[PDB]
Amino acid sequence: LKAQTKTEEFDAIKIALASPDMIRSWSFGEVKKPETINYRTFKPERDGLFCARIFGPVKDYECLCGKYKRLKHRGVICEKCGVEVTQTKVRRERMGHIELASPTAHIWFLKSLPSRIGLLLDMPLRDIERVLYFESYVVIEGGMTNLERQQILTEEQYLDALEEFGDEFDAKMGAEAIQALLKSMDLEQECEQLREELNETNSETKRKKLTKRIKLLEAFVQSGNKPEWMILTVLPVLPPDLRPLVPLDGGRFATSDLNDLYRRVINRNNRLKRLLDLAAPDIIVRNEKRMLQEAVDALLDNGRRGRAITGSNKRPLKSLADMIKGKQGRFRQNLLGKRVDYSGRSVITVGPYLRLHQCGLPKKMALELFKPFIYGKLELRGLATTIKAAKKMVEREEAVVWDILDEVIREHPVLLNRAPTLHRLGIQAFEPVLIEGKAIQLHPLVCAAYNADFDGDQMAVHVPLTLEAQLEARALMMSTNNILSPANGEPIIVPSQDVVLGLYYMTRDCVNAKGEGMVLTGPKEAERLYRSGLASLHARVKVRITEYEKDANGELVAKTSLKDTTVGRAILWMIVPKGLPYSIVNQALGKKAISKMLNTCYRILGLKPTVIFADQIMYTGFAYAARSGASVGIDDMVIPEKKHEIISEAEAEVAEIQEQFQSGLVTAGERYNKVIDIWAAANDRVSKAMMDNLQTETVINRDGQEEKQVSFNSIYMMADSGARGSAAQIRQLAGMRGLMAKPDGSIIETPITANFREGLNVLQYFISTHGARKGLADTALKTANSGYLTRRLVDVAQDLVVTEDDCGTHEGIMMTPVIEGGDVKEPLRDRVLGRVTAEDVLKPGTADILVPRNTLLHEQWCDLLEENSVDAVKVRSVVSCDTDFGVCAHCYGRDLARGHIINKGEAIGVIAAQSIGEPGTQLTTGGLPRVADLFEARRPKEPAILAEISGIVSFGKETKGKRRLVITPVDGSDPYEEMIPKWRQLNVFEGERVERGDVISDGPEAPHDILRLRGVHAVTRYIVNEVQDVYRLQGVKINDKHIEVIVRQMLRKATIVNAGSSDFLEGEQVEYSRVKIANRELEANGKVGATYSRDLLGITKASLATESFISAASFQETTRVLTEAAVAGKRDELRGLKENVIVGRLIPAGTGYAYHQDRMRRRAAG
Amino acid sequence: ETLRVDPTNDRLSALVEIYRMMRPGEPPTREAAESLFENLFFSEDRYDLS
Amino acid sequence: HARSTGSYSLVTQQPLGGKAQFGGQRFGEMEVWALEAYGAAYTLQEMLTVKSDDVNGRTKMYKNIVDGNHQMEPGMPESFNVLLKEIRSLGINIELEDE
Amino acid sequence: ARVTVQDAVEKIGNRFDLVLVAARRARQMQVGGKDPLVPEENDKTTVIALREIEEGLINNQILDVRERQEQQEQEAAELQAVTAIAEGR
Amino acid sequence: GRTTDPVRMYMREMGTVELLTREGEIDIAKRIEDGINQVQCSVAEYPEAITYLLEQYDRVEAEEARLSDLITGFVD
Ligand SMILES: [Mg+2]
Ligand SMILES: [Zn+2]
Ligand SMILES: [Zn+2]
Structure with a gap:
């Protein structure tokens, strides 16, 4: 099958240096003049920054001269002034160029911190600039005479050297010189020679730099880039409409600064050409060349030399680099935000009448929002002749349209969002209920998730247009589908204030009240007793109740008895569905117990009963609280x-x-x-x-x-x-x-x-x-600190998504209760809940397996573990998962807004980051900065030191500023001797044996150490326990999971020790590495497999390395990323979230995970 | 000890090092250094604490 | 405030109020993450492609919304499409590979 | 309305693939090619599809089967028409 | 040193050139006269340079050109 030529749906993207011819490919003509528009007839002057001939027609399907105005004439190039008549949109597309007289350096490759032209030529920056300004002469291809190839000479020196050697010696100056240097450069020979020199001499200083540079060189070779391209022959011009001249009111004009810049580059360039044809003296043409360099530099990236100012205005003119970078820190217009159609917002109000699955929507808002749907539906039933007439109808607000709106609204959810979106519950889907008035009504139980007060907070609405969006909203973002915090399995639907005062005032008891001591047949006549005014709401009373227990096999048992309770609890019991025991309502019902009510109801009866229960609890709470007449005097x-x-x-x-x-x-x-x-x-x-x-x-x-x-x-x-x-x-x-x-x-x-x-x-x-x-x-x-933290977190995780199903490793961490210093600062049941066992666990006796290898431990399994005395359970974690480039659902846990095991394709990194970030407002060395310090891996101020190796130690040498410590392993060799400053009071016993990782001093310790000496499980345990100490001290519930995924992302890179395939000391992906040595252990070399050493990178450091450059350009420094990628010819395959969001296609997770997978396997295949 | 870190010797020297501090890169002149230094804190025009 | 389909910005095609007919709500990074935590890809794509930045997809959407067919034929957001020209305006060649 | 989609999520495990399948079916109904498998209450195609998932008469397997049949149902029609294209020789 | 800012690398580069004496101007101008007159005389010694001017003036009187496109005028 013929592959293709014209537009397919593209994959990946590539970036590299641009050839002069490659630049000419894009260019549809050369702009030869600084002129913009004619000044009376505002038509474009031909061959100028705004040109109809080069770029495109001013108006749609019409020639400039006006000869061919007909939509029929299309591929026609006009005989008068060639303009192919086509939509004006192509003026937003077609590029251009400028042929520069003298060569010019590209400021991005001159001034990028590791100057590319510089380290490619192994030449310093200051020398290169000194040569560019004609402040000195530089040698090129010196031959054998007196001189080095890259050596720099002065006027007199060049003259003397020329008098001595006429030929077989060469030197230039200016841009042409540097370009000559780069072009003459042979990378291959340098490679060979450098390999040899690497091999010969042994010094750390020599071969470090040697290997670094050879690596750089071979990379640049493999790129496909040829060095000359760092020097600009041809300069591309950006399409006119991306830098428009468009008119304003009062006959005024407004235009982008690029014009002011581009124009300059043209003028001087042209002037330089003139100065060549007039045979000007050197001193002049040189100045003109420097000026051209400055102008081009200012055009590309302004601020790296002089910071040119725009015409008549002090404020520095914005260059192309500033166009790319954008602003508000690092934001690329996807990142800061984007305006969106079919949306709205307003002040919000209560609406307690609502079911939990709906929200009050102002009539007018729903009218303007669903307008196209309304138009289509109006003429679908034939109430409107045509779309125009439909518009006139709804614009007249004819009485008939309201019912049609009732039709288009019914099954069609809307998305509601609040201002500080933190966790995923910041956006939730609701069923719209048409409501008169301009305010949005929001269900009270949801007010907790939004952190939305009623003091004038506003909410925004978005319409889920495509069918897939309707079903996404209903099956995912729906209110009823998230009843549980993703951070911890506890209900987020917990009743807030008025309601809990209602249920509290309801089931409570005073000492003496009407009806005290009497007995009633059932809750019905208890309520009947109350409402009639006979019996008090709170009085001690025996009543017959029938409770239920499903404790049979999937089957509800029933039992009836005389319960000693109050009137209020009796009335309230009517609400409690089915299999819940009467024990739950027989208490005082505080905010804490009233939550565990919903929780138990969920873990027992399922979702639907829990939903309807919660609703009922809210309604009765409000009602009875209102009845109570509670007040404050x-x-x-x-x-x-x-x-x-x-x-x-x-x-x-x-x-x-x-x-x-x-x-x-x-x-x-x-x-x-x-x-x-x-x-x-x-x-x-x-x-x-x-x-x-x-x-x-x-x-x-x-x-x-x-x-x-x-x-x-x-x-x-x-x-x-x-x-x-x-x-x-x-x-x-x-x-x-x-x-x-x-x-x-x-x-x-x-x-x-x-x-x-x-x-x-x-x-x-x-x-x-x-x-x-x-x-x-x-x-x-x-607030700001929290936000910054969540930012760093999602940056470091993001693309982590559940990918495989089960990697199938027995690996995991040992889960014990936290047991701090007192009794149990947190139980075992909470730590192991909803997680999966690494291996089968014993009773106190054995060959009896209670929990069988890997099984989700739900409430029943954890209670079965609690029946028996089992104090310890090994549990699979996301940090130990064998799966590369993601996490297997089997290793994660069940946790979600749903109790079932985590789905295939849900993006866990993001929700982990959000889960850690949302509570961060409530946090108070210690505190939130302590958390930030932890995730950043930062070595503390006055750290301790751990024994490098086990065995008996002693003190050696004397006081130089360090008094050396000499370690003595039993069997093995001694030579490890650590230099410890002796003015720090020690701990380690001079006559005692110390295990590796023992206390040789006091103070906090850097987790780099803990990872190296104590091990991976040890360091992840330290991070999770310390950060959890910080949060738990404030009363914040966060499951260890999320922290563990953050940790896994922290340890993503490691540094090799042994060899046989790749380089020695390289920091690199343990995914890549482990998959390579698992591949190498068999086939290949029989085993050449290399040993590595796990590394600990802080979150802000780990977020630095990302395969996709489009992703890196977003949150990192844009300029550097673009350059540094452009040299290696790096090819971004997408595959991640951020990049796909940027490019505007389906997210490779969730609903989209099906697509990408189907595409990912089709790729690199038959 | 402040004097020992002082690169200058006489009044003109100090004025040179000051003028080249304020407006660097360009060749210093006697009348220029004097004019600048007198114009900074000592001129009724360019300076007031009121 | 409420908006269905309003005017649009010239420099980058994006929703903008010109009539005091208000520009749409700004969908930011955090809201994007919020959509990412849920499995909703299509809500997000429609959010940043057809409902906003796609000069083609928006109208092609409108016609389907009135026709009674809920779909999206997204195309490429004009922001990134402009960024390509901005990058390529320098000495940097950025291309879209394969198929 | 459909208040909780939980039962459908029970019928097909993934819950993302639920959105997908229910979508595909919802389009089989919305673009007019087919009819509901269960009484429409005024529920829009969105919810009708979900009811169809819940009652277990619709999922990815069933749909793929049906479509694969229809391919041959059209291939039955065009049978003479395309063989009349022997002009290829 | 060089502070960049190309105004400076110009200002300092031209500042090397020494101002002309009133006599030096006349010297240089004389040099110019010598040089040019050499090329003029060298042109006068070329037969084709003559015959060309002839063939051109024959075209001027034949209305294939104008007197302005050949001579700016003679001495006179
Ligand atoms: Mg508030
Ligand atoms: Zn024309
Ligand atoms: Zn795993």
């Missing part, structure tokens, strides 16, 4: 009666210590510490006073004299339930608030003795102000 906040006395005694303490300072019994600092301690203790006292009084002081009577229970006071119920408020803020309300701190970090020794219930005076408020401002500043900053 000024007398709802109770100050301790003993406050003033505490203040007084604590006030005696300070004057005591003060009297002791007056008599010198105590030093100033010790005094300060003392007084501060007494005030702090006082604060604690008042807090634990008001806490007791506020909490238990309801003292009430049942049938006897008295009894006392937990208070029914409003603010207490609020803080206790988990609705809103907390012991700290309550403490600030009634008891005194804190001891503030002055800006320098010190803490004022006279706290705020008053509170908010009382008044604060001038001083106390002024002092509170600093705390406030620092609070706002700090939080607003930590």
Whole structure:
């Protein structure tokens, strides 16, 4: 089959240097004049930056002169002024060129940090520039006389050398010289000679540089690039419409700066040509050449020499490099953002009536949004003659169109998004409900996922146009399909505030209330008792209930009994579906328990019942909370009666210590510490006073004299339930608030003795102000830090996607409870949950396998593990996965918004990064910067040192600034001797044996070490446990998984030790390497296989290396990436997410994973 | 010890090193260095603390 | 604010309000990642190709939206297509290989 | 409406391939080539396809089979027409 | 040194050239006169250079050209 010629759907992309002829290929004509437009008739002057002949017709399908105006005439080149009449769009396409008189250096290859022309010629930059400016002469192909090939000479020196040797010696200057150098260069010979020289001499200094350079050279050879091309003969001109002259209001014009630049390059160029034909003196033509160099440089990339300024305006004119780079840090117009059709936004409101799967959509918004659908549907049923008439109909807002809109809306989800999108729940799909009014209504249960308050936050809507988008939205981005955080299996649909105050007030009990002690047949007549006003909502009562347990095999058991409960719990029970026990509603139902209700419901009955349950819980929560008449008065906040006395005694303490300072019994600092301690203790006292009084002081009577229970006071119920408020803020309300701190970090020794219930005076408020401002500043900053972190994270992961199904390795990490110093800072059950066993696990006795090799451990398996005493389970992790270029689903875990095992093709790196990043706002060496330090691998300030090798050690030599430590292995050779500075207090025992990785000193340790000495599992364990320490200290739930994938991406590269295929010390992919030595172990060489050493790269460092250059050009420094890729002729195959997003095709993950796979296998095949 | 790191000797020398500091790369002149240095903090025109 | 199909920017063809008929909402990097976490490729492609940057795909889409056929024949986003010309304007040859 | 797609995800494992298959079928209905396999409630083709997945009468295997049959159904029609192209000789 | 900024590498490059004396100008101009007059005389010694001018003037009177396209005028 004939392969093809014209447009197919392309794969990969290539980048390289451009030949003069190659540049001429693109060019459809030479621009010979600086002229733009005629100045009266605004038509393009021919052969100028804007030209109809070279580039294209000014108006569609029309010749410039106007002779051929007919759409029939097309491939015709006009006889008057040749313009092929074609759409004006081709003026956005067709390029041009300029033939430069003298050769010119391309600023990108001159000034890139490792100057390409420089290190290709093994010549310094300053020399090359000194030669370019005609400030000295340089030799080329010196022959055998007196002189080196790359040697530089002066005027007098060149003259003398010329007098001595006329021929068989050669020297030039300027651009032509450098081009002569590059053209004369023979890379192959250099290769041979350098290999020889590499072999002969042994010095680290010599052969390091030697091998680096030979590698560079052979790379450039394999590229297909010939060095001369770094010097520009021909200069391409960008299409006119990409730098337009287009008119404005008031008859004014506006144009891109490139014109101003290009024009210059033309003028000077032309002038230079003139200066040749007039036979000008050298001093002149030289100046003109330099000027041409400067102009071209300014055109390509401005700012690397002089920074030319635009006409009449100080602001420096934007060059082509600045066009490519873009701005707002690193953003390429895909990255910063892109405007999108079929969308909208507005202020959002509540809408509690909504089911969890829908959202209120303003009528007008839905009208303008679905407009094309409405047009098509109106004439589909024939209510409109034509599309025009349809427009007139909906524009008139005729009454009939609203129903048609009701039709086009029904099954057709819309995407809702909020401003700070962090995790994937920042965008969710909903079913539109047509609503009068201009505000968007959003289901309350979802308000948690968006982090959306009602204080005027706005949300944006997007319409899923294509069918695939409708089904993606409904089956993926749908609200009901994500009930669980991807970070941890806990429900994100958890009831927020009003609702939980509702259920809390519902199931609670006071000591004596109407209907106390009586008995009822069932919840129905319990509610019937309540609504009629006979029985109180909360009273201790026995009622018959029928609960269910599915504990049979897939089968619901039933049992009935008399339960001792309250009226409220009885009424609430009506909602609880099926197989849930009555035990769950029989408690007080706080925000914590009310969550575990939904959770258990999900892990038992499945999705649908959990959804409908949650909805019901919300509705009843709101209803009953409204019934409750909960409120807040000024007398709802109770100050301790003993406050003033505490203040007084604590006030005696300070004057005591003060009297002791007056008599010198105590030093100033010790005094300060003392007084501060007494005030702090006082604060604690008042807090634990008001806490007791506020909490238990309801003292009430049942049938006897008295009894006392937990208070029914409003603010207490609020803080206790988990609705809103907390012991700290309550403490600030009634008891005194804190001891503030002055800006320098010190803490004022006279706290705020008053509170908010009382008044604060001038001083106390002024002092509170600093705390406030620092609070706002700090939080607003930590937002940015979080964002930056997520950025680095997704950059380092991204393309990691579940690819294979099972790599099939027994490998994994040993999972134990975290067990820190006290009892169990986190259990085993949470650590191993939803993960998969590496190998079968024992009972205390054996040949009895409870869990069989690799099996998803769900709640039942973990509970079965809990029944038995098993303290340890080895678990497969994403870090140990044998699969190359991705993760097998078998190694990942089940975790998702769904409880089933992770799907094939879901992109895990991104969700991992998001999962780590979203909570980062809540984080407070320690803290968020501690996390950033961790993922960046950074060696700490005052690190410890670990024993290089096991065996008995001792101290050796003396004090030079290092007192040497000599290690003595039992069997093996001694020679390892480490130089440890002796002014650092040691740990290691002079007479004791130390295992490798022991403490030879104290302080934190660099994970590079932990990886090298302790091993891979050790280092990943250190990272995960430390970062998890940071997060868990703040109360943040993040599964170890995500952190583990981040870690895997950190360790992607390693450095070889042995040999037999590739180079010695190269940092390289362990995917590539391991697949190569697994390939080498058999066939090939029998075994030549090479040993490597795993390396640890920080996230920002690991994100640096990416095969795809289009990807790198996005988030890295654009200029350098483009150059550095362009020299090697690097060929980007795409294959990743970022690059495919940039080029605008299907993501090689998720829904798209089917396509790419089908394409990936078709590639490199029959 | 500040003097020991001082490359200059006399007034003209210092003025040269100052003028070549402010407007470098171009050949210094006596009248130029004097004019500049007098024009910086000592001229009623180019300087005011008010 | 709401927009279906409005005016478009000249320099790069992108949605822009010229009538005080508002330019579309800006779909950023974070929103892209959000789409990437979900398995939705087509929502994202339609987001950055047909709904915005494709001077062909947008109209060809509109006609299908009215015809009752929900599909997309995406083509190449004009941003990247311009970037090609910008890169190639230098001494850099950037090509689209194979088939 | 279809509130949760979970049952369909049960019927075909991947859940991305669910979107794909349901899409393909939804187009078999939307572009008018075929008719629903189950009562349309006013559910748009989007949801009809999902109902078809849930009831287990539609997935990738079934579809590929049907289409592969239709190829021969047309190849049956054109049988004389294309053999009349013996002008190739 | 060289601060780049090509204005400078010009300014310093021309500044080497020494100003002309009032006599030197006349010397140089005289040199010019000598040089040119040599090529003029060398042209006068070429037969084809003459015959060409003849064949051209025969074309001028034949209306195949104009007097402006041959001579700018003679001495006179
Ligand atoms: Mg807010
Ligand atoms: Zn014409
Ligand atoms: Zn694996």
